[PDB]
Copies of this chain bind each other. A is one copy, B any other.
Amino acid sequence: GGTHIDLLFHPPRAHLLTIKETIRKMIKEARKVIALVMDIFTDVDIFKEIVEASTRGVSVYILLDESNFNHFLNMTEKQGCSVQRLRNIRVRTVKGQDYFHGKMEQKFLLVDCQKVMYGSYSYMWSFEKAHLSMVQIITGQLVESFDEEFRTLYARSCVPSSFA
């Protein structure tokens, strides 16, 4: 059992789907579990796909950088889609050492312990329209290391202050 990696770019280069389309496809095809680590999450289309997955019964765990968490909350509020009342979604925050906010500068999407998207694409409109980015689509043995890193992060994460 080896590892397979494909690269995708924004803008696209020698592949048929954009990175956003690929994210949405990965989430749409999720059967069991989605584990997301993200620095900034404001993209409504991606959020919708994740909400939809959770309503099909997929367990969703999301870890967000604490210092940008309010941006995700604002988006969920605008959408009328409180994450606290969605029973298959858990959202927790992760921070670094303050000195200026210390941040979780890691992001990746893991689906079904089978496929990881790892790269520089953040879930914001600006990554669809403005920024250059790249990711890897990873399958096989290395996915297990992303599973373990997700668990490690999850263990260092907090309940967001807002949730009661």
Q: Which of A2-24 contact B (CB under 8 A)?
A: 2-3, 5, 7, 9, 13
> A96 in the interface, Cβ–Cβ < 8 Å?
yes
How many residues of chain A get a CB closer than 8 Å to chain B's CBs? 34
Name the B residues within 8 Å of A152 (CB-CB). Answer: 13
> A161 in the interface, Cβ–Cβ < 8 Å?
no
> A29 in the interface, Cβ–Cβ < 8 Å?
no
Shortest distance in angstroms between A144's beta carbon and chain B's nearest beta carbon? 11
A130 CB contact (under 8 Å) in B102, B132, B149: B102
Given contacts A105-B131, A130-B103, contact A2 B2 (CB under 8 A): yes
Residue contact A105 to B129, C-beta cutoff 8 Å: no
User: In whole angstroms, how far apart are the Cα atoms of A132 and B122 in the complex?
Assistant: 16
> A74 in the interface, Cβ–Cβ < 8 Å?
no
Of the A-B pairs whose beta carbons lie under 8 Å apart in the complex, a sample of 25, sorted by A's number, is A2-B2, A3-B3, A5-B142, A7-B149, A13-B152, A94-B132, A96-B132, A97-B129, A98-B130, A99-B126, A100-B126, A102-B126, A102-B130, A102-B131, A103-B130, A103-B131, A103-B132, A104-B132, A105-B120, A105-B122, A105-B132, A106-B120, A106-B132, A107-B120, A120-B120
